[PDB]
Structures are given as C-alpha cells and as structure tokens.
Amino acid sequence: AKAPIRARKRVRKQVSDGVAHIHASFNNTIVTITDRQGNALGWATAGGSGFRGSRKSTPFAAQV
RNA sequence: CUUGAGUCUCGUAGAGGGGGGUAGAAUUCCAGGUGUAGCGGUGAAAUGCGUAGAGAUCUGGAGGAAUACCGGUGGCGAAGG
C-alpha cells in the first residue's frame, strides 16, 4: 500500500438500475431515486433549493 | 254509434321510481421498511405539515362519499329531476 488517491478509485455498490419517481406537485416538485423494488435510496427537492411555494412550483426549480 | 274516450293481448326503447344488494377505481388518512430534512401555500406568504423520523418511494392497514369514458337538442320522469 501507497498513500491513498486524491479522488475515489472505487464505489461501494453497483446495482446499475433504478427508477426516478417524480411528484411534480401543484406547489413544488420532489424527485426521489429508488431501487427497482421501490425502496428509496436518496431524494431532493425544488423547495429545499431556497424556494417557497411561489418559486418551488416551476420547471426551473424542478430542473434543480 | 265509434270516430272522442276507455281496455287487454302483443312487439319494444329507456339515466323513470321504490326496496335491497354490489365492483373496481379514486379523493383522503396512518404505520412501518427504504431514505433523510425536508414537506406544504399564495397575488405575498403566513397560517399549516417535519426533523420527536415526515414529504417522496415501496409494501401493509383504515374510512366515508361518488360513478370518468360512453353521450346524442338522445332516452326516460308526475314534477322536483
């Protein structure tokens, strides 16, 4: 063993495939990637990107 | 008398009515797994929902109300329908 790399050479799972489920809501948009059996692996939102109801509800907030 | 009106047979369309029964789907709501700090609401957000484990996604469970399409100036009703 040498001293370790500056950016990772490896990654701890490799399940390859999933589903992005989007709930594009009337006030927001919520995006969650889930494994193929529907157990959610991680998520993020429009509204948490510094937006209230009034801006989180847009395709640009959803894009983020 | 049969012509107005009345009567049965018989062909027949129908969201007509009353009584009871019913299927699938949905609006709603919860838990928990997975996940992790977000969710929700407008004109503005606040009010409201969370982090004490939500929202979202999967799976389990709960209630009460109503039938999208079809569909027509159509068909039916004593009218309200």
mmCIF file of N, CA and C (backbone and C1' of nucleotides) in Angstrom, chain B residues 3-39:
data_model
loop_
_atom_site.group_PDB
_atom_site.id
_atom_site.type_symbol
_atom_site.label_atom_id
_atom_site.label_comp_id
_atom_site.label_asym_id
_atom_site.label_seq_id
_atom_site.Cartn_x
_atom_site.Cartn_y
_atom_site.Cartn_z
ATOM 1 P P U B 3 -113.746 3.662 -35.183
ATOM 2 O "O5'" U B 3 -113.016 5.088 -35.197
ATOM 3 C "C5'" U B 3 -112.786 5.767 -33.975
ATOM 4 C "C4'" U B 3 -112.690 7.272 -34.196
ATOM 5 C "C3'" U B 3 -112.967 8.037 -32.906
ATOM 6 O "O3'" U B 3 -112.128 9.176 -32.854
ATOM 7 C "C1'" U B 3 -114.700 8.480 -34.577
ATOM 8 P P G B 4 -110.681 9.152 -32.118
ATOM 9 O "O5'" G B 4 -110.970 10.068 -30.831
ATOM 10 C "C5'" G B 4 -110.833 11.476 -30.851
ATOM 11 C "C4'" G B 4 -111.619 12.052 -29.674
ATOM 12 C "C3'" G B 4 -111.230 11.475 -28.321
ATOM 13 O "O3'" G B 4 -110.147 12.189 -27.757
ATOM 14 C "C1'" G B 4 -113.553 11.295 -28.601
ATOM 15 P P A B 5 -108.956 11.459 -26.955
ATOM 16 O "O5'" A B 5 -109.666 10.595 -25.795
ATOM 17 C "C5'" A B 5 -110.310 11.210 -24.699
ATOM 18 C "C4'" A B 5 -111.201 10.224 -23.938
ATOM 19 C "C3'" A B 5 -110.500 8.947 -23.497
ATOM 20 O "O3'" A B 5 -109.856 9.088 -22.245
ATOM 21 C "C1'" A B 5 -112.502 8.406 -24.599
ATOM 22 P P G B 6 -108.590 8.160 -21.891
ATOM 23 O "O5'" G B 6 -109.253 6.704 -21.666
ATOM 24 C "C5'" G B 6 -110.111 6.445 -20.566
ATOM 25 C "C4'" G B 6 -110.935 5.167 -20.745
ATOM 26 C "C3'" G B 6 -110.009 3.967 -20.618
ATOM 27 O "O3'" G B 6 -109.647 3.662 -19.288
ATOM 28 C "C1'" G B 6 -111.647 3.683 -22.345
ATOM 29 P P U B 7 -108.412 2.671 -18.980
ATOM 30 O "O5'" U B 7 -108.693 1.279 -19.732
ATOM 31 C "C5'" U B 7 -109.387 0.246 -19.077
ATOM 32 C "C4'" U B 7 -109.486 -1.010 -19.932
ATOM 33 C "C3'" U B 7 -108.088 -1.573 -20.149
ATOM 34 O "O3'" U B 7 -107.620 -2.240 -18.991
ATOM 35 C "C1'" U B 7 -109.477 -1.777 -22.114
ATOM 36 P P C B 8 -106.056 -2.594 -18.751
ATOM 37 O "O5'" C B 8 -105.932 -3.833 -19.762
ATOM 38 C "C5'" C B 8 -106.044 -5.135 -19.260
ATOM 39 C "C4'" C B 8 -106.102 -6.212 -20.333
ATOM 40 C "C3'" C B 8 -104.802 -6.612 -21.024
ATOM 41 O "O3'" C B 8 -104.180 -7.631 -20.256
ATOM 42 C "C1'" C B 8 -106.431 -6.128 -22.640
ATOM 43 P P U B 9 -102.590 -7.914 -20.259
ATOM 44 O "O5'" U B 9 -102.426 -8.539 -21.742
ATOM 45 C "C5'" U B 9 -102.997 -9.808 -22.028
ATOM 46 C "C4'" U B 9 -103.089 -10.101 -23.527
ATOM 47 C "C3'" U B 9 -101.759 -10.140 -24.258
ATOM 48 O "O3'" U B 9 -101.113 -11.384 -24.043
ATOM 49 C "C1'" U B 9 -103.424 -9.015 -25.550
ATOM 50 P P C B 10 -99.551 -11.486 -23.665
ATOM 51 O "O5'" C B 10 -98.906 -10.900 -25.017
ATOM 52 C "C5'" C B 10 -98.949 -11.612 -26.239
ATOM 53 C "C4'" C B 10 -98.503 -10.703 -27.387
ATOM 54 C "C3'" C B 10 -97.185 -9.974 -27.137
ATOM 55 O "O3'" C B 10 -96.088 -10.831 -27.436
ATOM 56 C "C1'" C B 10 -98.862 -8.499 -28.022
ATOM 57 P P G B 11 -94.533 -10.424 -27.207
ATOM 58 O "O5'" G B 11 -94.133 -9.321 -28.310
ATOM 59 C "C5'" G B 11 -93.768 -9.648 -29.634
ATOM 60 C "C4'" G B 11 -93.394 -8.367 -30.382
ATOM 61 C "C3'" G B 11 -92.218 -7.593 -29.767
ATOM 62 O "O3'" G B 11 -90.946 -8.183 -29.980
ATOM 63 C "C1'" G B 11 -93.931 -6.122 -30.251
ATOM 64 P P U B 12 -89.721 -8.047 -28.916
ATOM 65 O "O5'" U B 12 -89.646 -6.474 -28.559
ATOM 66 C "C5'" U B 12 -89.229 -5.536 -29.528
ATOM 67 C "C4'" U B 12 -89.225 -4.110 -28.984
ATOM 68 C "C3'" U B 12 -88.358 -3.866 -27.756
ATOM 69 O "O3'" U B 12 -86.976 -3.738 -28.055
ATOM 70 C "C1'" U B 12 -90.412 -2.659 -27.656
ATOM 71 P P A B 13 -85.865 -3.566 -26.888
ATOM 72 O "O5'" A B 13 -85.656 -1.975 -26.848
ATOM 73 C "C5'" A B 13 -85.164 -1.174 -27.897
ATOM 74 C "C4'" A B 13 -85.287 0.268 -27.387
ATOM 75 C "C3'" A B 13 -84.681 0.590 -26.017
ATOM 76 O "O3'" A B 13 -83.277 0.704 -25.976
ATOM 77 C "C1'" A B 13 -86.785 1.518 -26.126
ATOM 78 P P G B 14 -82.380 0.342 -24.682
ATOM 79 O "O5'" G B 14 -82.847 1.456 -23.596
ATOM 80 C "C5'" G B 14 -82.461 2.809 -23.709
ATOM 81 C "C4'" G B 14 -83.342 3.713 -22.835
ATOM 82 C "C3'" G B 14 -83.283 3.462 -21.321
ATOM 83 O "O3'" G B 14 -82.135 3.901 -20.639
ATOM 84 C "C1'" G B 14 -85.464 3.805 -21.901
ATOM 85 P P A B 15 -80.868 2.965 -20.344
ATOM 86 O "O5'" A B 15 -80.466 3.597 -18.913
ATOM 87 C "C5'" A B 15 -79.932 4.900 -18.856
ATOM 88 C "C4'" A B 15 -80.229 5.702 -17.586
ATOM 89 C "C3'" A B 15 -81.654 6.170 -17.290
ATOM 90 O "O3'" A B 15 -82.609 5.188 -16.903
ATOM 91 C "C1'" A B 15 -80.072 7.847 -16.737
ATOM 92 P P G B 16 -84.189 5.327 -17.230
ATOM 93 O "O5'" G B 16 -84.892 5.981 -15.925
ATOM 94 C "C5'" G B 16 -85.046 7.388 -15.819
ATOM 95 C "C4'" G B 16 -86.242 7.806 -14.976
ATOM 96 C "C3'" G B 16 -86.399 7.308 -13.557
ATOM 97 O "O3'" G B 16 -85.728 8.072 -12.580
ATOM 98 C "C1'" G B 16 -88.366 6.829 -14.736
ATOM 99 P P G B 17 -85.111 7.362 -11.278
ATOM 100 O "O5'" G B 17 -86.491 6.969 -10.552
ATOM 101 C "C5'" G B 17 -87.366 7.936 -10.014
ATOM 102 C "C4'" G B 17 -88.502 7.253 -9.252
ATOM 103 C "C3'" G B 17 -87.997 6.486 -8.044
ATOM 104 O "O3'" G B 17 -87.935 7.374 -6.947
ATOM 105 C "C1'" G B 17 -89.485 5.130 -9.346
ATOM 106 P P G B 18 -86.945 7.097 -5.716
ATOM 107 O "O5'" G B 18 -87.485 5.726 -5.067
ATOM 108 C "C5'" G B 18 -88.594 5.742 -4.191
ATOM 109 C "C4'" G B 18 -89.075 4.337 -3.834
ATOM 110 C "C3'" G B 18 -87.977 3.613 -3.069
ATOM 111 O "O3'" G B 18 -87.835 4.115 -1.749
ATOM 112 C "C1'" G B 18 -89.141 2.170 -4.573
ATOM 113 P P G B 19 -86.565 3.703 -0.841
ATOM 114 O "O5'" G B 19 -86.550 2.097 -0.826
ATOM 115 C "C5'" G B 19 -87.253 1.382 0.163
ATOM 116 C "C4'" G B 19 -87.128 -0.120 -0.062
ATOM 117 C "C3'" G B 19 -85.700 -0.613 0.132
ATOM 118 O "O3'" G B 19 -85.226 -0.574 1.465
ATOM 119 C "C1'" G B 19 -86.759 -1.705 -1.705
ATOM 120 P P G B 20 -83.712 -0.086 1.787
ATOM 121 O "O5'" G B 20 -82.834 -1.360 1.310
ATOM 122 C "C5'" G B 20 -83.024 -2.616 1.937
ATOM 123 C "C4'" G B 20 -82.556 -3.831 1.137
ATOM 124 C "C3'" G B 20 -81.064 -3.858 0.818
ATOM 125 O "O3'" G B 20 -80.259 -4.381 1.854
ATOM 126 C "C1'" G B 20 -82.302 -4.376 -1.095
ATOM 127 P P G B 21 -78.695 -3.992 1.983
ATOM 128 O "O5'" G B 21 -77.991 -4.735 0.727
ATOM 129 C "C5'" G B 21 -77.798 -6.142 0.717
ATOM 130 C "C4'" G B 21 -77.504 -6.659 -0.695
ATOM 131 C "C3'" G B 21 -76.079 -6.287 -1.105
ATOM 132 O "O3'" G B 21 -75.044 -7.085 -0.572
ATOM 133 C "C1'" G B 21 -77.578 -5.976 -2.885
ATOM 134 P P U B 22 -73.501 -6.593 -0.588
ATOM 135 O "O5'" U B 22 -73.088 -6.441 -2.131
ATOM 136 C "C5'" U B 22 -72.882 -7.516 -3.010
ATOM 137 C "C4'" U B 22 -72.447 -6.934 -4.357
ATOM 138 C "C3'" U B 22 -71.054 -6.324 -4.249
ATOM 139 O "O3'" U B 22 -70.057 -7.340 -4.253
ATOM 140 C "C1'" U B 22 -72.501 -4.908 -5.402
ATOM 141 P P A B 23 -68.477 -7.001 -4.189
ATOM 142 O "O5'" A B 23 -68.231 -6.389 -5.650
ATOM 143 C "C5'" A B 23 -67.958 -7.170 -6.796
ATOM 144 C "C4'" A B 23 -67.359 -6.221 -7.831
ATOM 145 C "C3'" A B 23 -65.959 -5.721 -7.476
ATOM 146 O "O3'" A B 23 -64.935 -6.663 -7.748
ATOM 147 C "C1'" A B 23 -67.331 -3.923 -8.114
ATOM 148 P P G B 24 -63.396 -6.430 -7.290
ATOM 149 O "O5'" G B 24 -62.810 -5.053 -7.916
ATOM 150 C "C5'" G B 24 -62.343 -4.951 -9.252
ATOM 151 C "C4'" G B 24 -62.377 -3.503 -9.705
ATOM 152 C "C3'" G B 24 -61.345 -2.542 -9.117
ATOM 153 O "O3'" G B 24 -59.981 -2.770 -9.442
ATOM 154 C "C1'" G B 24 -63.470 -1.557 -9.308
ATOM 155 P P A B 25 -58.767 -1.810 -8.934
ATOM 156 O "O5'" A B 25 -59.255 -0.312 -9.224
ATOM 157 C "C5'" A B 25 -59.046 0.354 -10.438
ATOM 158 C "C4'" A B 25 -59.619 1.759 -10.319
ATOM 159 C "C3'" A B 25 -59.028 2.705 -9.286
ATOM 160 O "O3'" A B 25 -57.776 3.222 -9.671
ATOM 161 C "C1'" A B 25 -61.335 2.817 -9.132
ATOM 162 P P A B 26 -56.676 3.726 -8.601
ATOM 163 O "O5'" A B 26 -57.448 5.021 -8.013
ATOM 164 C "C5'" A B 26 -57.545 6.176 -8.817
ATOM 165 C "C4'" A B 26 -58.539 7.237 -8.347
ATOM 166 C "C3'" A B 26 -58.156 7.981 -7.082
ATOM 167 O "O3'" A B 26 -57.377 9.076 -7.532
ATOM 168 C "C1'" A B 26 -60.389 7.199 -6.918
ATOM 169 P P U B 27 -56.387 9.930 -6.597
ATOM 170 O "O5'" U B 27 -57.364 10.793 -5.642
ATOM 171 C "C5'" U B 27 -57.806 12.098 -5.977
ATOM 172 C "C4'" U B 27 -58.717 12.690 -4.889
ATOM 173 C "C3'" U B 27 -57.992 12.723 -3.537
ATOM 174 O "O3'" U B 27 -57.135 13.824 -3.314
ATOM 175 C "C1'" U B 27 -60.146 11.891 -3.285
ATOM 176 P P U B 28 -56.007 13.747 -2.157
ATOM 177 O "O5'" U B 28 -56.771 13.200 -0.845
ATOM 178 C "C5'" U B 28 -57.438 14.046 0.062
ATOM 179 C "C4'" U B 28 -57.914 13.234 1.270
ATOM 180 C "C3'" U B 28 -56.728 12.818 2.108
ATOM 181 O "O3'" U B 28 -56.292 13.906 2.899
ATOM 182 C "C1'" U B 28 -58.377 11.077 1.959
ATOM 183 P P C B 29 -54.760 13.985 3.374
ATOM 184 O "O5'" C B 29 -54.683 12.743 4.386
ATOM 185 C "C5'" C B 29 -55.305 12.823 5.650
ATOM 186 C "C4'" C B 29 -55.382 11.472 6.352
ATOM 187 C "C3'" C B 29 -54.000 10.873 6.514
ATOM 188 O "O3'" C B 29 -53.208 11.659 7.385
ATOM 189 C "C1'" C B 29 -55.627 9.191 6.052
ATOM 190 P P C B 30 -51.603 11.488 7.477
ATOM 191 O "O5'" C B 30 -51.472 10.034 8.129
ATOM 192 C "C5'" C B 30 -51.837 9.863 9.479
ATOM 193 C "C4'" C B 30 -51.719 8.421 9.949
ATOM 194 C "C3'" C B 30 -50.306 7.882 9.816
ATOM 195 O "O3'" C B 30 -49.475 8.452 10.818
ATOM 196 C "C1'" C B 30 -51.895 6.253 9.083
ATOM 197 P P A B 31 -47.863 8.331 10.769
ATOM 198 O "O5'" A B 31 -47.722 6.741 10.823
ATOM 199 C "C5'" A B 31 -47.844 6.068 12.057
ATOM 200 C "C4'" A B 31 -47.668 4.568 11.877
ATOM 201 C "C3'" A B 31 -46.256 4.214 11.464
ATOM 202 O "O3'" A B 31 -45.391 4.343 12.584
ATOM 203 C "C1'" A B 31 -47.810 2.992 10.174
ATOM 204 P P G B 32 -43.870 4.882 12.428
ATOM 205 O "O5'" G B 32 -43.224 3.644 11.643
ATOM 206 C "C5'" G B 32 -43.203 2.365 12.239
ATOM 207 C "C4'" G B 32 -42.779 1.283 11.255
ATOM 208 C "C3'" G B 32 -41.665 1.624 10.275
ATOM 209 O "O3'" G B 32 -40.379 1.433 10.839
ATOM 210 C "C1'" G B 32 -43.514 0.836 9.067
ATOM 211 P P G B 33 -39.065 2.089 10.163
ATOM 212 O "O5'" G B 33 -38.914 1.017 8.990
ATOM 213 C "C5'" G B 33 -38.491 -0.312 9.194
ATOM 214 C "C4'" G B 33 -38.421 -0.952 7.810
ATOM 215 C "C3'" G B 33 -37.395 -0.295 6.912
ATOM 216 O "O3'" G B 33 -36.086 -0.651 7.305
ATOM 217 C "C1'" G B 33 -39.377 -0.632 5.732
ATOM 218 P P U B 34 -34.879 0.401 7.183
ATOM 219 O "O5'" U B 34 -34.955 0.741 5.630
ATOM 220 C "C5'" U B 34 -34.537 -0.147 4.621
ATOM 221 C "C4'" U B 34 -34.652 0.590 3.293
ATOM 222 C "C3'" U B 34 -33.876 1.907 3.334
ATOM 223 O "O3'" U B 34 -32.489 1.789 3.075
ATOM 224 C "C1'" U B 34 -36.016 2.225 2.392
ATOM 225 P P G B 35 -31.444 2.842 3.718
ATOM 226 O "O5'" G B 35 -31.970 4.293 3.270
ATOM 227 C "C5'" G B 35 -31.811 4.779 1.961
ATOM 228 C "C4'" G B 35 -32.660 6.034 1.784
ATOM 229 C "C3'" G B 35 -32.205 7.226 2.598
ATOM 230 O "O3'" G B 35 -31.068 7.862 2.080
ATOM 231 C "C1'" G B 35 -34.470 7.034 2.787
ATOM 232 P P U B 36 -29.842 8.259 3.028
ATOM 233 O "O5'" U B 36 -30.455 9.657 3.546
ATOM 234 C "C5'" U B 36 -30.792 10.687 2.632
ATOM 235 C "C4'" U B 36 -31.640 11.790 3.262
ATOM 236 C "C3'" U B 36 -30.849 12.473 4.391
ATOM 237 O "O3'" U B 36 -31.074 13.862 4.207
ATOM 238 C "C1'" U B 36 -33.027 11.776 5.071
ATOM 239 P P A B 37 -30.334 15.033 5.050
ATOM 240 O "O5'" A B 37 -31.501 16.111 5.194
ATOM 241 C "C5'" A B 37 -32.053 16.739 4.058
ATOM 242 C "C4'" A B 37 -33.314 17.510 4.427
ATOM 243 C "C3'" A B 37 -33.051 18.562 5.511
ATOM 244 O "O3'" A B 37 -33.917 19.667 5.288
ATOM 245 C "C1'" A B 37 -34.744 17.062 6.164
ATOM 246 P P G B 38 -33.435 20.975 4.462
ATOM 247 O "O5'" G B 38 -34.025 20.667 2.979
ATOM 248 C "C5'" G B 38 -35.391 20.859 2.641
ATOM 249 C "C4'" G B 38 -36.141 19.537 2.497
ATOM 250 C "C3'" G B 38 -37.634 19.745 2.269
ATOM 251 O "O3'" G B 38 -37.982 19.940 0.909
ATOM 252 C "C1'" G B 38 -37.332 18.418 4.146
ATOM 253 P P C B 39 -39.187 20.929 0.479
ATOM 254 O "O5'" C B 39 -40.472 20.101 0.945
ATOM 255 C "C5'" C B 39 -40.736 18.787 0.506
ATOM 256 C "C4'" C B 39 -41.966 18.254 1.236
ATOM 257 C "C3'" C B 39 -43.156 19.157 0.976
ATOM 258 O "O3'" C B 39 -43.837 18.783 -0.197
ATOM 259 C "C1'" C B 39 -42.953 18.793 3.289
#
